Amino acid sequence: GNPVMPARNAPAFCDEYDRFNRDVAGEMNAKKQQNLQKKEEVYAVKRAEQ
Amino acid sequence: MREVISIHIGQAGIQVGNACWELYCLEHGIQPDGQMPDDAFNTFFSETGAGKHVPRCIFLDLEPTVVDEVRTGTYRQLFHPEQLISGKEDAANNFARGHYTIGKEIVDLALDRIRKLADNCTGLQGFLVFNAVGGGTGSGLGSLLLERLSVDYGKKSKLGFTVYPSPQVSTAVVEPYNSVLSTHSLLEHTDVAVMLDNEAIYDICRRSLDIERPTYTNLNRLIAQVISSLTASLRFDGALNVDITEFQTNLVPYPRIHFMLSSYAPIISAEKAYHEQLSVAEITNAAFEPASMMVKCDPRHGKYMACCLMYRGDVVPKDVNASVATIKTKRTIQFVDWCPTGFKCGINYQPPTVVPGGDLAKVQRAVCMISNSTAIGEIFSRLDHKFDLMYAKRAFVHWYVGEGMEEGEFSEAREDLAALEKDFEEVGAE
Amino acid sequence: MREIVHIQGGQCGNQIGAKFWEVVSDEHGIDPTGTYHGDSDLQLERINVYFNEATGGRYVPRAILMDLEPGTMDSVRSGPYGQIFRPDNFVFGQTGAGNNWAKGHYTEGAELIDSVLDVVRKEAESCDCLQGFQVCHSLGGGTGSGMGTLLISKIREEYPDRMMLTFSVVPSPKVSDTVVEPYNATLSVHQLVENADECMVLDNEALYDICFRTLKLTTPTFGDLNHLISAVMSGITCCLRFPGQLNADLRKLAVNLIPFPRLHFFMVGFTPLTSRGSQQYRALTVPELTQQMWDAKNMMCAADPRHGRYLTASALFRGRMSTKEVDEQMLNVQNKNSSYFVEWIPNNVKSSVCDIPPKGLKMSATFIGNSTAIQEMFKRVSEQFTAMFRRKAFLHWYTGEGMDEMEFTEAESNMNDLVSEYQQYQDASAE
Amino acid sequence: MREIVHIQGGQCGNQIGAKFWEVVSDEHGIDPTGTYHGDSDLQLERINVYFNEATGGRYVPRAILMDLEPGTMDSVRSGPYGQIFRPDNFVFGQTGAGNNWAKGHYTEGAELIDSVLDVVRKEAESCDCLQGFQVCHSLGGGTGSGMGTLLISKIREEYPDRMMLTFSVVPSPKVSDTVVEPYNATLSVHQLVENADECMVLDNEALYDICFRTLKLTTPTFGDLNHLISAVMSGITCCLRFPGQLNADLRKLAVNLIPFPRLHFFMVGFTPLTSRGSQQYRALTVPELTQQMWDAKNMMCAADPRHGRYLTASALFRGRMSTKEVDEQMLNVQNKNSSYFVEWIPNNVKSSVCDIPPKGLKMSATFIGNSTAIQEMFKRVSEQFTAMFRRKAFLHWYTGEGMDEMEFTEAESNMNDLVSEYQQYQDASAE
Amino acid sequence: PLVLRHIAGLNGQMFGAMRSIPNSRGPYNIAQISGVSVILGNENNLAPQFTLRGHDDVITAFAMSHGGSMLATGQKGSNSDVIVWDVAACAPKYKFQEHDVEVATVSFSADDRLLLSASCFTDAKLYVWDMATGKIVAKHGLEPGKRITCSAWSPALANGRAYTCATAAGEELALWTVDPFTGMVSGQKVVLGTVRREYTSLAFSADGAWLYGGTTSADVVTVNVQRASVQMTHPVCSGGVGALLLSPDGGGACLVGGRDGSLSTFNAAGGAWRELRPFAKVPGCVTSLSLSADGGAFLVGTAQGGVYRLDRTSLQLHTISQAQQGQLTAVAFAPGQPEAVATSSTDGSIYVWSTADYTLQCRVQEPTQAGGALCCVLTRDAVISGWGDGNIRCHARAAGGATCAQMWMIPGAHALAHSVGVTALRLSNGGAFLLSGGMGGELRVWDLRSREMAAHMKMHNSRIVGAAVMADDKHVAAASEDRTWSLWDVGSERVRTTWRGQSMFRGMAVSADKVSVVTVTLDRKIQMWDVRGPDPRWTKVEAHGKEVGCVASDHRGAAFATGGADQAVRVWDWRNGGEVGGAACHSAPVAAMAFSPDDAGLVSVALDGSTCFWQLT
Ligand SMILES: Nc1nc2c(ncn2[C@@H]2O[C@H](COP(=O)(O)OP(=O)(O)OP(=O)(O)O)[C@@H](O)[C@H]2O)c(=O)[nH]1
Ligand SMILES: Nc1nc2c(ncn2[C@@H]2O[C@H](COP(=O)(O)OP(=O)(O)O)[C@@H](O)[C@H]2O)c(=O)[nH]1
Ligand SMILES: Nc1nc2c(ncn2[C@@H]2O[C@H](COP(=O)(O)OP(=O)(O)O)[C@@H](O)[C@H]2O)c(=O)[nH]1
């Protein structure tokens, strides 16, 4: 295959969907919300440990 | 009471009659079978004891194909089989063929059926003759039929919605010839002749309806809408009722000058509809726009002599008065110095019904502006040189001569069109 | 209900007519047996223009086959559609004309012409209304040209008002098949000018050029040339047989094409002719059809229109198409090539539209051009005829059949006069 | 709706163009039969830039293949995507140019150039709006360089305002395939300087180095190099074909890149090029793409930018990305490597963002650098050309095809002047 | 779980689409070609059928082995493969991928030992394969572009050094002497002699040396094989020939079909005069002729999709099955009646079938210029269909097999100079009006009593496919090519919704509850939507291997089917998703389908013409 063509199961790989999405702000907002929730959960776990 | 007999001569006449009768059936609720599940249909239809409505129409053609398309198509049970009259040989774009040799028996039978149809009418507002100036069938047979109608019926108002050759674009070669012949014929017979140009209607479809590929179906649909707006006051009541008899009284200053420019407004597709207010003033301005005119003839070159406006739908006399005042005060629109009023406004409460499969959208208001203006001499000026350019070499003259015509007929038609030109110049000048 | 009586003359005429009837039957869904198997109402709607109904569902073509040798019509009968024709319409002699127009027009055609006119009259009287007769044949062949001209004269005498259409295969410019081609062509053109109302000039070398350049075929036999001729022959009359958005019969075409009665020779072309390789890669659009139609390579006549001037031109389009598109395309062509169009005719285009395209094609368009380019074709034929007649080569063959030498001079004078008329309207100026 | 006409020249150009059209058809979801199987609206939204619609759903590439020997085109046609191209767009001669620029430009290129321009005009007139032409070919080959320069000159004459983009495979520094590569390159560069609006230099040895070091491909075929070139050729115009957060067409790139008309040569590179082993290990971020992009080994031209000074540099990014992140990365690169950037231009970066990444890649970025480093490559080509021309080795073939010896001197002078301009702007100081 | 009950398909264009299996004591007496696959079924209907599917595109050539093997050939896709099928195994036996373009024809030797395969394009090869292992002779070359129409083998001259194969290509006949011991092919062109006819079928005599070729000219040309020249010609069956079979016993007889449905018995002896007199007439154009039921029937096929059984002892005519011909576009069920199923097609034909026995209840036929029946709606006594010309024709439903009478027609319902042809017709619940969707995205509600237009509703800018009316004076569209779908109101005013996805839609259905709406996208994703929700509730990715083209819904709201280009119909729970049951039986992409009004029953149609009936229990 084409060397430029990424292999499956790679950080570079994206399906045909998630390509042509053309939505950056929504993805960043969703990732920000997920990171905030994960950070709150981590703080809760550390609080429980302390 | 207000019956109007419709005549459709030639392929163009029949193909605009298809749209016209589809529109009338849709407006009156008449199913294509012939009957509806009042008395407003009496203008266009006569009801039988069985409840079935037949149109008071006559489809005349020397070619069998066009009429057989109707006989086999959707409205085969609606129209009368004998009312559809078909010839055996086409006129072959020969005015002489359609007026002197083939058309004799066909037009005699047409008068027979027309008399039978008029026998079913208590009153008779007039005739609506739809033909094509520029074809042997439409020109020759139509001229002969109009002459016979003038001879026998007499003072009945015959409105000829003629389709004239476009300035540059065309489909025929002897079109200037038979156009000049037909114009000479109908200058003295029709009461009100409405000029239509395929180029102008194509431009209307391209610019207003955004149709990059307009066709005869679209053109005929627009013409049908114009005629329905014209006849709406006969079938539906409204403030400022206008009649067929009132047209030529309020629009024809002199008998020779009876050719009419027609403009419909608004012309918008469904996608572009309901995006603008479409007020009475705006649609009146659009109707008076030169581009919306259904003839390739800029009104700015000439001067308006009369303008009859037919409004349909939610139209109020206050708004129509304001719009007409703005039109009069506008400098671009110029009326003749000898006509102070020059306006015949008539409102109707029935909005124009939308044909399924048409590109026109459902609009609560509509304007049909039919005007007498001296600018219309421009189209005659174009045909007068397109004719003589061939006539110098006597091209295609043998074809017309072979069916019982003379060079004298061509000379007389050319001289008559020149007289029409000079009459237009005289009325335009102070 | 406007009937057409088809006649085939000579070997070339018989083969062309057989191919044409094959194509028309395929278009109307008629199998070689006469029965209808098309599954479409419009196909049977106007089938009476060409066919008559037998006792059953059989449809017999209104075709009349002529020859002086029986082998050609034996081949015609044994061909794919040989069994549709009524056997009574095969009129044959026993000794063929030896490529001798004199034999085919005076000696041997005289006996058979009585039977030919009898069959023609029988076919015409059965017709409800007759648009006219179409005769397919070849100029430059003995029986073909001779009997065709004689029959055209007889039918002109009998039915003056009825239309006469001719598909004549003029001898090719470069490669000539028979030696006596200039003689036969010169004699036949004199008859066609006087009698034929409408005539189409076809050249085998133009057909070879178009089928090798556009169709890009490798081994084009006479069948392919006959197929192109059949396509044009069908497309000219498809407006009679099918509904049209703007229909136009043969008389309408003749009226809008012929400016003056003697100038009735036309070069014809069919679009779209696409090679098998590029069939998908092309696009069927009205501009594309017009562009291919106005190309000189599309012309089936040897003469290229660039040298001459288009007196008139009819274009019969077929398919679901925009009349606005058609009119705009042809007006644009006229404006762009105003040099090639006659000035004293403001509109040189007769556009017709038919609702039914040919089988397999979404869109099609046949072209009939009356231009002064055919002047060079006639000039070349006369250039050969004069060279042969100066030394009177092969003149004794025609002289011994009982036609005067002065007939050659009269025919040459008439043909030169036609050339002069074409040149006069080529270089005529307005006002 | 801003169309581009693709042209392939010579064997290398034809192979590169075939690979490029395969890549574009894959990216737009077009199967080798031309039907759309792409499963996205945006793919068909702007497919008209490179393709035209056939009779059905087939899409015909707007490509023109030009060659003097039919073998390369036969191989391309037999290849996987050989059937999409219109057969009429294959313009080939019969005797190939023996690595002779004179044969490809004067003797044999003269006859075929008429057909080539005919096909080019037919393709261009069909375009509603024309951005311009892109010509892929190889310097240092007979037919390729010859008709490449000839056709570029002709298209410049016909369409002056329309864009010209060139992908020229300049002969590689160390390994040379043919002997007359310096002659052909010297003759072709002189033409490109005058004619081509925008020129893209590619070297086979630079491609081998990049695919052996970054891709860690050990024995790279020519197909691999062609496919890298194809990725660059797609990415340069993806802003035309897809919606972008900050789009930039070819003319915008040219305006932002070319400071002075003669300095229109660029080195290009593609990101992210990852070896198969490290594909899971590499994480794609805009800083990572920029770090790989500004690396000298990433450039597909043999000249390394460290020696020269970046006059300008455009980077077309592709994918859902932060404009702040991209702009910060490029500004930081400029600040860190200010020694390598020309001082009298405050911002040497034209950053463009398209929202549609290529197939398989989450993000990508194509780089286009105008730097004075190209001076050393032209210097090497002149070093070989002068050495050969001093002894006039192999000169007699070019002489016998009909160019004066003075053409070689004029071409060498023009190339030396271009080198001088590049050095001038390399060592130019502000104020 | 989906259970396949019956497949109705027949490639009516092919000459020899259906063929018997001689001396077939077990099941699967007949074999038909319908598309990608082969329907191997019993002579009597209402019996299980097998689907020999190993191809990727349409089948171009079908061959019997005179009892023992079937063979089908591919088309395009660079995989025009000759695949040999076994009667007992019902599995592929040999796969010859040696033709670069579609295999023009294929035939089996009279002794079932040799196999002739002929291509036409860019590699024209008469491959002869042995029943054991592979090929015997490479080719003889032919010429590209010469359409090899048909082929036959000589029963005689089987001495191991000779095998006479007759091949008709256009108007050319060629006899190919094949030495399989040496693997040589010698091709002698038959001297025509003014005999130019297109040969539909070829058949040698019992003793050879006389090859009968049936032509489109209703003639059988008898050619002397020994001299390789046309000997004589006789008219046989007015209409054409189609199928030509050797008489089951015969003196020198040969059964001839015709395009008129006539079946006659032509004998070479008997003089030049024939005076045609058929012994049996079938409805349609005969394309296949065979013998089965222990040689008691003639098993005559039809170009109209029909298979018929003609008794030999008493000439009794019994139909077997009917197949809708063309690309089938819509399936409709009567509002309450599960016994009648309406199937439309791109060909102007609509078949109303009795699902109990798959017989043709009635047929609606329209001319080709009337477009194609792109949508259909069934009524207790009416068939309403929307065509490619934009017109909506309603025909009087008939019974027993007859051409229906057109009661009425809405003309120009959807034809606006930019898109013609109404799609996705729907009827109001209980029956009040008719919802229609144009090719350009205009929704139109039509009264039924007066056929008058009641609502024109134009917001969607592309093709409508999958419109559906809710339970109360409201409706919703699918609007393919613009990846959005909107719920509307009959008061000519959109009620919010207008949900946009990311990929273009292909079909949309509404569940029994008025809140659940299923859409299918070309991304092979099934999207579930709640009318009360602004986002789809969930989406199932990769529902089919290829694009999904149609979606259905049970009237109880429990399950909904999904058919795609993978030729497989699946069933999914409305709320939980998952696969209730899936199966691939159509020999084409599935274009449309309909659930039965009751629990059991699903009727799906394919692009080739295959109608598959399914039991859901
Ligand atoms: N506006 C409009 N004009 C049309 C239409 N159809 C035809 N025409 C015009 O009508 C002219 C000819 O009409 P006809 O005389 O009826 O043609 P025909 O039926 O063949 O009869 P002849 O031509 O006289 O033999 C043409 O020049 C067209 O310009 C139409 O549908 N709409
Ligand atoms: N297009 C075409 N031309 C033919 C055919 N057969 C003969 N010709 C040409 O017709 C010309 C005259 O031959 P022809 O008139 O048929 O001979 P005749 O029948 O004895 O008079 C010859 O020059 C041939 O080239 C044919 O089947 N098709
Ligand atoms: N990247 C790449 N380079 C090539 C390819 N084919 C040839 N080349 C190189 O291009 C240079 C010029 O060759 P070319 O112009 O194609 O030869 P011509 O067609 O006879 O003029 C040669 O030195 C080759 O090394 C290819 O497919 N890909």
Residue D46's CB: how many other CB atoms inside 10 A? 18
**Residue E353, class by beta-carbon neighbours within 10 Å (0-12 exposed, 13-18 middle, 19+ buried)?**
buried
Q: D12 CA to middle of ligand 3, Å? A: 4
Residue E381's CB: how many other CB atoms inside 10 A? 10
CB contact under 8 A, D39 and E523: yes
Give the CA count within 13 Å in the CB-facing half-sphere of B74.
Answer: 18
Q: Does B356 touch chain E (CB under 8 A)?
A: yes
**Residue C142, class by beta-carbon neighbours within 10 Å (0-12 exposed, 13-18 middle, 19+ buried)?**
buried
**Residue D23, class by beta-carbon neighbours within 10 Å (0-12 exposed, 13-18 middle, 19+ buried)?**
buried
Q: Residue E519's closest CA among E571, E475, E560?
A: E560
CA E612, E614, E617 angle in degrees (round to 5)? 170
Indicate the angle between helix axes D323-336 and D286-293, nearest 10 degrees. 40
Distance CA D89, CA E180 (A): 45
Q: C11 CA to middle of ligand 2, Å? A: 6
> Least CA distance to E406: which residue of chain B?
B74
CB contact under 8 A, B174 and C46: no
Distance CA B170, CA B383 (A): 12
Residue with tokens 């309207």: C425
Write the DSSP string, E26-76: SS--EEEE-SSSEEEE-SSSSS--EEE---SS----EEE-SSSEEEEE--S
**Residue A31, class by beta-carbon neighbours within 10 Å (0-12 exposed, 13-18 middle, 19+ buried)?**
exposed
Which run of H or E residues covers position D239? helix D222-241
Interface partners of chain B (CB pairs < 8 Å, 3 or more) are: C, E
Sheet containing E69-73: which strands, arranged edge to edge? E62-64, E69-73, E80-86, E92-99
Give the CA count within 13 Å in the CB-facing half-sphere of C164.
Answer: 25
β-bridge mates for residue E365, sequence order: E349
D140 lines ligand 3 (CB under 6 A): yes
CB contact under 8 A, D87 and C282: no
Give contacts of D41 with chain E, Cβ < 8 Å: 481, 483, 503-504
Q: Do chains D and E touch (3 or more CB pairs under 8 A)?
A: yes
Contact yes or no for C371/C425 (Cβ under 8 A):
no
Sequence-separated (6 or more) residues with CB below 8 Å from residue B419: none
Sequence-separated (6 or more) residues with CB below 8 Å from residue E102: E60, E73, E74, E75, E76, E80, E119, E120, E121
Residue with tokens 């017979």: B189
Write the DSSP string, D185-228: HHHHHHHHHHH-SEEEEEEHHHHHHHHHHTS--SS--HHHHHHH
CB contact under 8 A, E217 and C82: yes
Q: Residue E342's closest CA among E388, E386, E306?
A: E386
CB contact under 8 A, E412 and B357: yes
Q: Residue D181's closest CA among D11, D394, D374, D339?
A: D394
**What count of residues does chain D have?**
431
Residue with tokens 């001396």: E23
In E537-615, the DSSP E strands lie at: 538-541, 548-551, 559-564, 568-573, 577-584, 590-595, 602-606, 611-615
Residue nearest to atom 26 of ligand 2 (CA): C12
Tokens at residue D274, please? 């990852």
Which run of H or E residues covers position C113? helix C108-126
Q: Do chains C and D touch (3 or more CB pairs under 8 A)?
A: yes
Sequence-separated (6 or more) residues with CB below 8 Å from residue C393: none
Sequence-separated (6 or more) residues with CB below 8 Å from residue E413: B356, B357, E386, E390, E391, E392, E422, E436, E438, E444, E446
Ligand whose nearest atom lies closest to the CA of D101: 3
How distant, in Å, are the alpha carbons of B75, B113, B178, C344, D355 from that of B7?
A: 17, 11, 20, 36, 62
- How near does any CA of chain E get to the CA of B9, in Å? 24
Distance CA C166, CA C155 (A): 12
SS3 state at C374: helix
Sequence-separated (6 or more) residues with CB below 8 Å from residue D78: none
Evaluated on CA atoms E291, E297, E302, E304, the torsion sign reads negative
Contact yes or no for E320/E302 (Cβ under 8 A):
no
Distance CA E597, CA E336 (A): 6
Sheet containing E172-179: which strands, arranged edge to edge? E148-153, E164-169, E172-179, E184-189
Q: B221 CA to middle of ligand 1, Å? A: 15
β-bridge mates for residue C20, sequence order: none
Q: Residue B261's closest CA among B231, B228, B291?
A: B291
Contact yes or no for D398/D101 (Cβ under 8 A):
yes
Burial B294-325, CB ≥16 within 10 A → b, else e: bbbbebeebbbbbbbbbbbbebeeebbeebbe
Contact yes or no for D196/D166 (Cβ under 8 A):
yes
> Least CA distance to D31: which residue of chain E?
E77
In C242-372, the DSSP E strands lie at: 265-271, 310-318, 349-354, 364-371
SS3 state at C187: helix
Q: Does A5 touch chain D (CB under 8 A)?
A: yes
Contact yes or no for E61/E17 (Cβ under 8 A):
no
Tokens at residue D49, please? 């830039």
What lines the ligand 2 site, CB under 6 Å? Answer: C 10-12, 15-16, 96-97, 99, 138, 140-144, 169, 177-178, 204, 222, 225-226
Burial C177-196, CB ≥16 within 10 A → b, else e: eeebbbbbbbbbbbbbbebb
Distance CA D282, CA D214 (A): 12
Give the CA count within 13 Å in the CB-facing half-sphere of D350.
Answer: 25
Distance CA E461, CA E480 (A): 9
Give contacts of B399 with chain C, Cβ < 8 Å: 255, 258
Burial E478-497, CB ≥16 within 10 A → b, else e: bbbbbbbbbbbebeeeeeeb
Distance CA D22, CA B314 (A): 61
Q: Does E481 touch chain D (CB under 8 A)?
A: yes
Residue D122's CB: how many other CB atoms inside 10 A? 14
Q: Residue B2's closest CA among B121, B131, B161, B152?
A: B121
Sequence-separated (6 or more) residues with CB below 8 Å from residue B361: B268, B269, B270, B272, B273, B274, B354
Residue with tokens 């094509």: B132
Distance CA B175, CA B413 (A): 14
Distance CA E302, CA E211 (A): 24
β-bridge mates for residue C317, sequence order: C353, C365
Q: Does C215 touch chain D (CB under 8 A)?
A: no
Tokens at residue E503, please? 């990929």
> Chain C neighbours among E 158-187 (CB < 8 Å)?
171
Which mutation among C8, C12, C222 tests ligand 2's pocket best, with the greatest number of atoms within 8 A of CB? C12
SS3 state at C224: helix
Tokens at residue D21, please? 């059209």
Sequence-separated (6 or more) residues with CB below 8 Å from residue E79: E56, E57, E97
Q: What is the DSSP-derived secondary structure letter of residue E368?
A: G
Q: D387 CA to middle of ligand 3, Å? A: 23
Which mutation among B7, B9, B11, B67 tests ligand 1's pocket best, with the greatest number of atoms within 8 A of CB? B11
How distant, in Å, are the alpha carbons of A29, B130, B248, B295, C313 from that of B192?
A: 71, 12, 7, 16, 36
Q: Residue E171's closest CA among C78, B162, D317?
A: C78
Q: Residue B110's closest CA among B164, B74, B152?
A: B152
CB contact under 8 A, C255 and B94: yes
Q: C177 CA to middle of ligand 2, Å? A: 9
β-bridge mates for residue E605, sequence order: E592, E611
Within C315-405, where are the H helices? 323-336, 374-391, 395-399
C-D C-beta contacts closer than 8 Å: 25
In E225-371, the DSSP E strands lie at: 229-235, 244-246, 253-257, 262-267, 280-281, 300-301, 306-310, 317-322, 331-333, 340-343, 349-354, 359-365
Contact yes or no for E85/E101 (Cβ under 8 A):
no
Dihedral, B182, B184, B189, B192 alpha carbons, nearest 10: 80
Distance CA D233, CA D236 (A): 5
Residue nearest to atom 17 of ligand 2 (CA): C141
> Least CA distance to D33: which residue of chain E?
E77
Tokens at residue B252, please? 């024809």
Q: Residue C277's closest CA among C358, C207, C355, C215?
A: C215
Which run of H or E residues covers position C131? strand C129-138
Distance CA E439, CA E423 (A): 7
SS3 state at E614: strand
- Torsion angles phi and psi, residue E364, rounded to 5: -110, 125
**Residue A48, class by beta-carbon neighbours within 10 Å (0-12 exposed, 13-18 middle, 19+ buried)?**
exposed
**Residue D82, class by beta-carbon neighbours within 10 Å (0-12 exposed, 13-18 middle, 19+ buried)?**
middle
- Torsion angles phi and psi, residue B373, rounded to 5: -140, 150
What lines the ligand 1 site, CB under 6 Å? Answer: B 10-12, 15-16, 61, 63, 66, 90-93, 98, 132, 134-138, 163, 171-172, 175, 198, 216, 219-220; C 246-247, 252
Q: Residue B196's closest CA among B14, B62, B370, B355?
A: B370
CB contact under 8 A, C280 and D55: yes
Secondary structure in 3-state letters for chain B? CCCEEEEEEHHHHHHHHHHHHHHHHHHHCCCCCCECCCCCCCCCEEECCCCEEEECEEEEECCHHHHHHHHHCHHHCCCCCCCEEECCCCCCCCHHHHHHHCHHHHHHHHHHHHHHHHHCCCCCCEEEEECECCCHHHHHHHHHHHHHHHHHCCCCEEEEEEEECCCCCCCCCCHHHHHHHHHHHHCCCCCEEEEEEHHHHHHHHHHCCCCCCCCHHHHHHHHHHHHHHHHHHHHCCCCCCCCHHHHHHHHCCECCECEEEEEEECCCCCCCCCCCCCCHHHHHHHHHCCCCECCCCCCCCCCEEEEEEEEEECCCHHHHHHHHHHHHHCCCCCECCCCCCCEEEEEECCCCCCCCCCCCCCCCEEEEEEEEEHHHHHHHHHHHHHHHHHHHHCCCHHHHHHCCCCHHHHHHHHHHHHHHHHHHHHHHCC
> Least CA distance to E524: which residue of chain A?
A17
> Least CA distance to E506: which residue of chain D?
D39
Contact yes or no for B419/B386 (Cβ under 8 A):
no
Tokens at residue D82, please? 């050989």
Interface partners of chain A (CB pairs < 8 Å, 3 or more) are: D, E
Residue nearest to atom 6 of ligand 1 (CA): B12
Q: What is the DSSP-derived secondary structure letter of residue C36?
A: B
Q: Which amino acid is at E377?
A: V
Residue D327's CB: how many other CB atoms inside 10 A? 15
Indicate the angle between helix axes B377-393 and B175-186, nearest 10 degrees. 130
Contact yes or no for D30/D84 (Cβ under 8 A):
yes
Tokens at residue B335, please? 């009326």
Q: Note if B246 is an active site residue.
A: yes
Which run of H or E residues covers position C9? strand C2-9
Residue B367's CB: how many other CB atoms inside 10 A? 27
Asked, as a colleague might, if the bond just before A3 is cis with ω within 30 of 0, I would say no
Tokens at residue B227, please? 């005629």
Sequence-separated (6 or more) residues with CB below 8 Å from residue E83: E54, E55, E71, E72, E73, E74, E92, E94, E95, E96
**What count of residues does chain A have?**
50
